[PDB]
């Protein structure tokens, strides 16, 4: 339950220059001091070449802790993004948690 972090991806392989989104869902016991953000090859998303972006971290206070959600949207699936080590990062004062996804591996 909490803490927790899970990344989901499309089951069906996306063709070259296709579109897709990656879902990152976390839980943190810290309602205020917790963040969620994506990295690609260790870089902020807004620093990467290509057509991609992350949405806002939505936050919902449940009974197990606080759920954080953030989408990474890939507008055009190029070879470079297909081979990128995307990483969803949850951070709060107790721990750092990461989950990594490389599309080329997942579909291989």
């Amino acid at each position: 339950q909490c803490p927790a972090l899970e990344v989901t991806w499309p089951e069906v392989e996306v063709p070259l220059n296709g579109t897709l989104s990656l879902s990152c869902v976390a839980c943190s016991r810290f309602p205020n001091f917790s963040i969620l953000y994506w990295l690609g090859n260790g870089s902020f998303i807004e620093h990467l070449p290509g057509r991609l972006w992350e949405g806002s971290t939505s936050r919902e206070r449940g009974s197990t802790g606080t759920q954080l959600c953030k989408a990474l949207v890939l507008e055009q699936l190029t070879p470079a993004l297909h081979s990128t080590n995307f990483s969803c990062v949850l951070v709060d004062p107790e721990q750092v948690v990461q989950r990594h996804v490389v599309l080329a591996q997942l579909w291989a």
């Binding site: 205020n32 963040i35 260790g42 004062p93």
Partner: protein
């Protein structure tokens, strides 16, 4: 490198329930205060804790700032704790910074926090008495369960 995200207005209290404040000489000190009247909760006691995302994730990286006539930010330059007249920046190109602390949960005290310097690994913000002052200093960790480096952060937003 760091990028700034959201900020939380915060009253920071030491182990004796005294409140952090920025004094007339930019010294970080602590003072007694009651929880009943907010005219007591003066501008110099209302801190802005800004969270940063990190390219090398290692902890809850934060700056601690306060809004008076001008904005001031806590620094540990040269291992001394001071307030610099500057706004916390949107980006920091380094992996460490004299204004970036890692805010860490105290493992056996669920609602308490410690602040570790990113510049000086193993050094923490701490409260120490000198004369009639209760000072915020930087201390190398030397004692398990040291209560002098533990703080309560009360959200005020």
């Amino acid at each position: 490198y760091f990028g700034k995200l959201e900020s939380k207005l915060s009253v920071i209290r030491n182990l004796n329930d005294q409140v952090l404040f920025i004094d007339q000489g930019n010294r970080p000190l602590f003072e007694d205060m009651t929880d009943s009247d907010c005219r007591d909760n003066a501008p110099r006691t209302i801190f802005i804790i800004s969270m940063y995302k990190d390219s090398q994730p290692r902890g809850m990286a934060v700056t601690i700032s306060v809004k008076c006539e001008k904005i001031s930010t806590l620094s540990c330059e040269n291992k001394i704790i001071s307030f610099k007249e500057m706004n916390p920046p949107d980006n920091i190109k380094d992996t460490k910074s004299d204004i970036i602390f890692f805010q860490r949960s105290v493992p056996g005290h669920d609602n308490k926090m410690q602040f570790e310097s990113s510049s000086y690994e193993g050094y923490f913000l701490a409260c120490e008495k000198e004369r009639d002052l209760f000072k915020l200093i930087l201390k190398k960790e030397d004692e398990l369960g040291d209560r002098s480096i533990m703080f309560t952060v009360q959200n005020e937003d």
